[PDB]
Amino acid sequence: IYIIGISVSLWIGLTILGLFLNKAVFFSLFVPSGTPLPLVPVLVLIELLSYTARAISLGLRLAANTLSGHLLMSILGNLVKIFGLIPLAGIFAIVILEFAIACIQAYVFAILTSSYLKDSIY
Amino acid sequence: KVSLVAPHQAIFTNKEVSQVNLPASSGEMGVLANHVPTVEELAPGVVEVIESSGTASKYFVSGGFASILPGSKLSISTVEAHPLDAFSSENIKSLLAEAQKNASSADETVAAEAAIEIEVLEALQAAV
């Protein structure tokens, strides 16, 4: 699941960069705020470079959720050796936060794609 | 230079003052010589104005809006401004006891008006 998540996220990042480059062949380009200054081409850490960082951050949700569930093996040996009822409440809160993180990660990926489509048509 | 004019009489009127301490909405602010521009709301506290030496006149204001102009002018516009010696201790206890019993006892604006009257009566009775 970890290797399939990084491979699926890399294909979505290449499609976002290819769609923005195809629209620049008939609607100018620029994409730079000018305010009586220069050195705007050196800070090209967005658009093309931003797709690589957004794909690794969105694809890491599958690996982070598996790390929380795999951490119960270290707490299972100590609870079967204070009362052990504190581990049940902590595992229930981490499972609810991991399931709710999938909806927040899906909304963050759709919000990032809306900025690329709106800037390519302006 | 103060302009503490009420809606029935004038206290400061002419510019012949030095320092004045009036309770605003945030804290107990105090105007000095060339005060900065600050138009904050005045709460129900004591508005004392020090006249040069120790000739301060404590005026219990009912609340208003302390306006500070940029030319070292303070306009304290309040509804009622009376001294601390014009209040009675026996009559102040009758208004505070009736407002506490009427609070949270009905509906509409009867219970909301009793909470504001109990807070203003407790602050004036503690400054005697």
Partner: protein
Amino acid sequence: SSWQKAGISFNKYLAIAARTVQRSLKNDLKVAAEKRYISDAKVQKLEKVSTTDLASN
């Protein structure tokens, strides 16, 4: 207080604080002061020259 949630503005909040401070002071110093907190005025909203019900609180 929380006067922004109701229908009390700055004019109604200043009149309620001035009337409560005058009644809680000296009873003998109430000369020419009870008329400033009591009025017999009425308000009636008109429409088109007809009007609705007259209210006076």
